[PDB]
Amino acid sequence: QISVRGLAGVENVTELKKNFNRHLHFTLVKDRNVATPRDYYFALAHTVRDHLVGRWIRTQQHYYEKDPKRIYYLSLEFYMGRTLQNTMVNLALENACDEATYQLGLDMEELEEIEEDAGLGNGGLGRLAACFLDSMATLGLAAYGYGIRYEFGIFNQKICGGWQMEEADDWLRYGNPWEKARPEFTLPVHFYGRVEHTSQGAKWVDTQVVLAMPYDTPVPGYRNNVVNTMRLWSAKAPNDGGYIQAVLDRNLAENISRVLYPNDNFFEGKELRLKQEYFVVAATLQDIIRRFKSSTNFDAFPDKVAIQLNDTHPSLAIPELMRVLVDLERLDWDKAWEVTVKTCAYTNHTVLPEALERWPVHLLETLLPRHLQIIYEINQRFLNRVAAAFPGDVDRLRRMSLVEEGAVKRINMAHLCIAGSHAVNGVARIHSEILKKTIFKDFYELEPHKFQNKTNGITPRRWLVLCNPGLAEIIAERIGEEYISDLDQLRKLLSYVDDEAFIRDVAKVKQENKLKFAAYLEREYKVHINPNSLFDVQVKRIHEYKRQLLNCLHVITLYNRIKKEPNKFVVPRTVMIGGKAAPGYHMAKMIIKLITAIGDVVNHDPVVGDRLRVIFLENYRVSLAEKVIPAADLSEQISTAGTEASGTGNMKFMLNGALTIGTMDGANVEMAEEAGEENFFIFGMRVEDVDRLDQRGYNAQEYYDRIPELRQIIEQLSSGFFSPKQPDLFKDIVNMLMHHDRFKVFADYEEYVKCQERVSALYKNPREWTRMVIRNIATSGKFSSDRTIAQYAREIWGVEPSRQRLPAP
Amino acid sequence: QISVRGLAGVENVTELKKNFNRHLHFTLVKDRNVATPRDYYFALAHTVRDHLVGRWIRTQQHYYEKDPKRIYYLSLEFYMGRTLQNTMVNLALENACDEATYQLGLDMEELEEIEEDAGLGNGGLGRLAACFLDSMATLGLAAYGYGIRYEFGIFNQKICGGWQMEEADDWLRYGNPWEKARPEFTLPVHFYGRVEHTSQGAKWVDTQVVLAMPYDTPVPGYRNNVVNTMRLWSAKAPNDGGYIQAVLDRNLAENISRVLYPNDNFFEGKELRLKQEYFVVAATLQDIIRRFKSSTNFDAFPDKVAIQLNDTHPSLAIPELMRVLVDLERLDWDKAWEVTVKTCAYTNHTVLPEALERWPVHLLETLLPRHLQIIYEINQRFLNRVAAAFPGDVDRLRRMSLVEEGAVKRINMAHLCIAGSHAVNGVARIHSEILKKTIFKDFYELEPHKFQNKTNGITPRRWLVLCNPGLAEIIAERIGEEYISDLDQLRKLLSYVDDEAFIRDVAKVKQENKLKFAAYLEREYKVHINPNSLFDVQVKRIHEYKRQLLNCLHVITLYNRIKKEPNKFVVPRTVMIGGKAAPGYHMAKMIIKLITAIGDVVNHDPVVGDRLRVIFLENYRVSLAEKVIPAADLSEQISTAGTEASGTGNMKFMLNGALTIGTMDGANVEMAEEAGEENFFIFGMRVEDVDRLDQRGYNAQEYYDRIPELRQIIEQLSSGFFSPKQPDLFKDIVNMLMHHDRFKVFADYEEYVKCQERVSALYKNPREWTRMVIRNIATSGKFSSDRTIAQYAREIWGVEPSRQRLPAP
C-alpha cells in the first residue's frame, strides 16, 4: 500500500502464507474451522519471529568472532510495548505480511491489536531504555539489555466511579512468542549470610541461594540485519515443617521477579525491591565476566566492557564488581577500583528528592553484608580524597559521604554511583547544568571531568514510521526514506513550508489520524468527541510536578467563560488527559478523580454543546500512546521549571505534527531552540524565577486574592460544584493548592491561560497553524535516539557506531 | 535394526532429518556448533510431536462428527513416565528416527535418557491410569483422561548416609514439548462462600474463584492413527494490605496445582488435598456438560457420557453433578439422581483402612457448603432405602451411613461412591470377592447388581515392545507382530517350549538385558554386581503390607548360612530392592535404612565374595522400571494375603521373563492360575489362614521361640550388628515385628525361605529355568490392559471397542 512499508514480492508473500498455515497447524494445533483472531495473531507472530532467528544467530556469532567492546545496559525497566509491527518494520516485511494475510482473508491491523503490551516499565525511564535498545541495534553496537522478567508488569488501570482501580497485568497469560527461555544458562544469586575473614581474604558464607533463569528476546536493528539481545532474568528456587510446605515455600524465592514496583520518580525502600536490584546485578555481572574470560588480566576489562547504569536502581553493580574482582579474582583493591570506575557510567533521571534511593544501613547489613563493608571502604577512601583536595572543609565531608547519618543511617546510592563511575550524565542540557550547580555541585568541583550531558531522544521507527505511516509517507515522497535512520534530514522539509501541496497533505494526515482516533474512542469505551475540535492532550504519569492540575484549572476557566457568555464564539476543543497514578500516591489518585469529575459536569452541560469536551484516557500505555500522539494538535508539557529532567513524550508529539505549549523545562528548552521560539508556545516562570520566588517565599493566597477567575474556580471546588453528593470531596486538593504546593500551580496560571488564548487564535488559521507544524517536524531531528546513542558511544563507551548492513540473513 | 521397530524408508528418513534441523534452528534457536545433547533431544521430540498433530486434530474432529459416547477417566494421578519412545512405537517411527539421527551422527538412545519422567503419580493407581489411556486409544474409544498438572510430581529420592532424602521434582524446568496450553479454555472453580435459599432453588454465593487452565497432551493409539486427549488442569488466580502484596498473594490460589501428595495407599486429610480433588472435578464436569450440550433433555446424558472414578479421590464428581443438574439446570432431584447414578462408576483400589478417605464434616462445611447439604440429602434418601429393605436393622443403618459419627463427624467417600454409581469394581478377582464378603458386604446385599470385577492389566506396548525390544523380536520371529495388540496370541509360544532354538534365544535376551543393566548400574552410581548371579528384585513403593521386611529377613538368613559354612556352594544372587517411602511414613523410612545397612555389611564381607550382593535401587520410577524389569530373574510379590488388591508390577515381570515368588494375593492368584501353579513359586498363608490366625490372635513370640535362625536375626538387629555406631538404631523395627506387626512377617518366614531354596535349585538348571519362563510369558496374555479396557467398555460403559485404523493422517 504505502512505499515506506517495503515490497510485497511474489515469492515472499507465497512463502509467508505457507509458513503462516504451517504454524497454525503445527504450532497452535488448530485447523481453520476453529481458529480465532488470537490464534491468527500467534500464527503471524511465529512466522515473523522465524525471519529473525537466522540473523540473531549470526549477529551473536559475529560478536564472538570479531570480539568488539560490549555495551551492557542495566535497567530495572524495559517499557517495550508491542513487538509484532516493530519487527516487521525493521525487517521490511510490513507490506508483504499485509498482503499475505489479506490473501488469507485476514485484516492484519485487527491481528496487531491482539498482542499484549510488554509493560515492564513505569514511564519515561523505562521507555528510554526501550528506544535505546532499538537505536543501539540500528547503529550496529554489540549491546545487551539486561533486566528482570516481571510476570506482572505495570498494572492495568480501570476507572470506576471516576476513581482509578488497579488490576494485575497478566501479560504472559497467552504466552510470549518473542522470548526464548534458556534454562541451561541459569545462574546462582546469593542473599543474606555473613562475612568470614580468612587468612587470605574475606568470604561470604551461609547464604541463601536463588537461581536466575534467563529469557532472551531479539532486538532487531533497522534494516541492517543486526539482531541484538535483551536478556531478562526470572527467579527460580533451587531444588535442594513438612515436605509439602517446603515445596510450597519455593514461591518465596520466586516472588523476586513476580511484579514491577509501580512507582514513577518515587523511592519506596522495601526489601523486596532491594532484592530485585541485587538479583539483576548479580546475575548480569556473571554473564559479563563469563563472556569476557572467553573473548586472566582484568586490565583490558574496561577496553572490552562498558556498563551503563540507568538511574541508581542497578547501582549495586559497583560494589558487586569490586566483590568479584577482590574476593574471587583476588585482585588488589586499587587495581579493582581502577577497573570498576573505567567500566561504569551512571545516568541520572531526576533531581526530585523523593526519587533518590537512600537505603537503610540495617537493610544492606542483613541482606548483603559483604557489599556494605565494600561500600564503607569505598566511602572511606573517597572521603580521604575529598579531605586532601579541600583541607579542613569538614561540612563538605559530611555532604559528600555515601553514608548519610541521622535518624537511621542510610546509603546514598547516587553518591555511590558518582564515586564509582568515570562518567555521570544528565538527560537534557538544563538538567545536566542543574546537577553541576546544585545537587552534585560538590562532586562536580572534585571531579569536573566526570560530568556530561546526553539529551534524551526517541526512536523514529516506533514513534513515526510505525505509529504514523501516513506522515512518514508524505515525507518520504519529497525527501526519500533515508531520514528513517538519519532524522536530521527532516531539515530538508523546511523548503516545503510554503509549498501548498505539502501544507495540504500534512493537514490531511492529521485530520485522518484524528478521525481514526475519534472512531477508536467510540468502538472501545463509547464516547462522543468531535473530530473538528482542537485535540488538546496531556498524557504521562500522574504527578504533582507534571501539573495536570494546572491543565484542570485552564479547563474549568474555559468552562466558566462559556457559561458567562454562552453565545460567544470559541475555538472548539477536546481536552484529553491520561496517565496512571502509583497505587499509594493519594494526591495523584485525587487528581484523576478531579479530572473525571470535571468531565461529568462539562460533558453534560447543554449550553456547552460540542464546544468543550473533557476526556480521561484510560489505561495509558505504549500502545495507546501510539494511537493518541499521531492524533494530537496540542501537546501539554507544563511541568514547573526545573522539575522535569528531560521528558520524552514532548519529543514524540513534536515529530508527529502537534504544536507544543510548555514551560522552559527539561528538553522543552532544546526543542524550542531547534524550532525557534516563535514556533513554540512558551509561558511561565523560568528556573531563575522559581528560585527567586522560593527566596521570597511562595504564598498562593496572593494569587487567589488578585485573580478573580482563579478565586471563582477554588470556590467552586470548595463548595462542591464538581461533587454534589460529596461537597468536601476535593478538600485535600484545595488545601494543598492554598497552603503547601511545592510546584506553584497558581504562579503560572495567568501566563498559562493567556498563552492558551494565543493557541486558539492560531488554530483559527488552518494554513498558518499547519505551517508552524511543518517547522516543528522539520527541526525535530536532534531528538532521535540515534543521535543520543551516537553520543553515548563516542563520549562515554568509546566505540564507533556503524550503519553497515550485516552480511545478509 | 529390529523388525518390530518399523521401516526406515528413504523418503521418511530424509524428511525426519530436515525437520530435525528445522526445529534445532527455528525452535531451539541454536546452530550445530553449540547444541548440546539436550538440545538434540528437544529437536527430536518436536519432530516426533509434529507427526501427531494431524492425527490428533482429525481424531477429535471425528468424535465431533460421529458423536460417540464419551468416556471420562478422572484421576488425581497419571504416572506417564517418558513420552518420546512410546510415541515413536505407536506411530511406527522408531527405526526411521533411529536411522535419521544416526545419519546426523547422534545416538538416539542417549537422547531418550535426557527426557524427564512425567511423574504425576505415586505408584500402582497412577500407572494404571497411564496404561488405561494407552489401551483406550488403541481400542478406538472416545476417551478423555482428566487430572491435575502438578508443577512438582513425585519427589526425586536421594540416598544419603543410607537414608532417604527428598528433593523437588522440577520436571518442567526445561519445558514439556508434548503438552499444548489452552489458556483460551480456562474455566472458573468456586470455593468457600455460603448457601442462600431463594424462592426457586438454593444458591451458592460469595465464593472465592480460582481459574482452571487446561493443558492438553496427545495420547496415541497403537498404529491405528487414533490420538486421544489427556487434559490436565493448572490453577490460576483471577486478575480482579497493599498493591504489591495483593499481587504476591495470587500464589495462594495457584498452590492448588503446585505439588502431588506423595502418599501411596494412605489418607492424609489436609485441606489443600481436598481443594485439589474438587478443583479437578469442578473444571472437568463443565467440559463434560459443555461437550454434551453441543453433540436440553439430560435423559440422554448417560447414553452420551460415562464417568469413571479412579478410587474415591474424584468422588466429589457425584454431588457436583447433582449440584449442576439441580441448582443450575433446574432438574428435579429424582431425575438428576437417576442420571448421576447411570453416569458414574467407581473403582476401588484397596481394603486397607488407613487408605480410606473420610473427610471431616467441618472441612466440607467451610470449603464446600452446598456439596455437604447435597451429601446429607443423598444419605437421607439412601438410608430410607436401606430401612425399607431391612426393617428394624438399626445397626445396618449406622454401618451404611455416608456420615460417620464419633469424635469428629466424617463423610465416608467410599460409601458416597457406591450409592452414586451404577457399577463398583475391585481390581482382581480375590479383591472383588473380599469387597463383597467384608468391607462392602452391606452394600452388596442391598444392591448385588452393582458389584463387578475388572482385573488390572498393563500395556504391552510400554511394558514389552518399548522396554524389551529383544524379547519382542524373538517372539515376533515365530508368531508375527499381531500379539502387540492381541496379547492372548502369546499362547502360541507354548508350542516352542521344547524348541531348543527358542529356549536359547529367550535365555540370550535375558542375559543381554542383565549385562545392559549391570553396566547402567556402574555408569551411573558406580556399583559392582556380577551378571552371572540370579537377579532377585523387589521394586514397588515401600510399605509394611508389601513386606520388604520379609525379603530383608531372607537376605540376612542367606548371609548367616554362608558365614556358617563359607566353603559350601550356593547359587549366587544379586538382591535388588527399590522404592520410595512417603515422607511422613516413619517405619517405611526405617526399612530403607535397614536395607542399605544390610548392604553395608554383606557387600564388604570378604568371605561372601560375589556370591551375595544387596543393592538398594535409588529413585525407583517408571523409566527405571523399564530398565530393571527386563533384567530380572526373580520377581518378589510377597504382600500378606488379602492386602495387595491386585498389583501390576507382578504382571510386568511375568511378561518380561522373570519367574515369580509370591503369596496367593491380588492378581498373583490369577497369574498362577493362568500359567499353572507348578510354574509359580507360591508360599505362605492364604487369606483364610490369616483370618484363622487373627481369630486365635497373632503372637510373634511363638515363631521367635521355635525358629533358631529367626531368633539369631532378631538378636543381630537388636545388638547393633548392622549398626555398630548406633546399637539401638533398629529398635522400632524389632519392637514392631515382636509386638505390633499387622502384617505377620514371622508367620510366613519359614515357608518363604524354604520356597526360596526351591528357586535356587531350579536356577542351577538353566534349561529348565528357561522352559518355566517360557510358560509364564506364553500365558501372560490375560494381563494386557487391552483385555481390561475391553471389559470396562462392554460391562460398565456400554461401548464397543474397535481395532479399525482411522482414515490415515
Ligand SMILES: O=C(O)CO/N=C1\C2=CC=CCC2=N\C1=C1/C(=O)N=C2CC=CC=C21
Ligand atoms: O476436545 C474437544 O471437545 C474437541 O477437540 N477438538 C480439537 C482438538 C483437541 C486437541 C488438539 C487439537 C484439536 N483440534 C480440534 C479441532 C479442530 O482442529 N477443528 C475442529 C472442529 C470441530 C471440533 C474440534 C476441532
Ligand SMILES: O=C(O)CO/N=C1\C2=CC=CCC2=N\C1=C1/C(=O)N=C2CC=CC=C21
Ligand atoms: O471454535 C470455537 O468457538 C471453540 O473451539 N473450542 C475448542 C477447541 C478447538 C480446537 C482445538 C481444541 C479445542 N478445545 C476447545 C474447547 C475446550 O477445550 N473447552 C471449551 C469450552 C468452550 C468452547 C470451546 C472449548
Ligand SMILES: O=C(O)CO/N=C1\C2=CC=CCC2=N\C1=C1/C(=O)N=C2CC=CC=C21
Ligand atoms: O506522605 C505519604 O505518606 C506518602 O507520600 N507519597 C508520595 C508523594 C508525595 C509527594 C510527591 C510525590 C509522591 N509520590 C508518592 C508515592 C508514590 O509515588 N508511590 C507511593 C506509594 C506509597 C506511598 C506514597 C507513594
Ligand SMILES: O=C(O)CO/N=C1\C2=CC=CCC2=N\C1=C1/C(=O)N=C2CC=CC=C21
Ligand atoms: O550471548 C552470547 O554471549 C552468545 O550468544 N550466542 C548465540 C545466541 C544468542 C541468542 C540467540 C541465539 C544465539 N545463537 C548463538 C550462537 C550459535 O548459534 N552459535 C554460536 C557459536 C558461538 C557463539 C554463539 C553462538
Ligand SMILES: O=C(O)CO/N=C1\C2=CC=CCC2=N\C1=C1/C(=O)N=C2CC=CC=C21
Ligand atoms: O556451547 C556451549 O558450551 C555454551 O553455549 N552457550 C551459550 C549459547 C549458545 C547458543 C545460543 C545462546 C547461548 N548462550 C549461552 C550462554 C549464556 O547465555 N550464558 C552462558 C554461560 C556459560 C556458558 C554458556 C552460556
Ligand SMILES: O=C(O)CO/N=C1\C2=CC=CCC2=N\C1=C1/C(=O)N=C2CC=CC=C21
Ligand atoms: O502414626 C502416625 O503418626 C503416622 O502413621 N503413618 C502412616 C502409616 C501407619 C501404618 C501403615 C501405613 C502408614 N502410612 C503412613 C503415612 C503415609 O503413608 N504418609 C504419611 C504422612 C504423614 C504421617 C504418616 C504417613
Ligand SMILES: *Cc1c(COP(=O)(O)O)cnc(C)c1O
Ligand atoms: C514516552 C512515554 C512516557 C514519557 O512521557 P513524558 O511526558 O516524558 O513523561 C510515559 N509513558 C509512556 C507510555 C510513553 O510512551
Ligand SMILES: *Cc1c(COP(=O)(O)O)cnc(C)c1O
Ligand atoms: C507398575 C509400577 C508400580 C506398581 O508396582 P506394584 O508392585 O504393583 O506395587 C509402582 N511404581 C512404578 C514406577 C511402576 O512402574
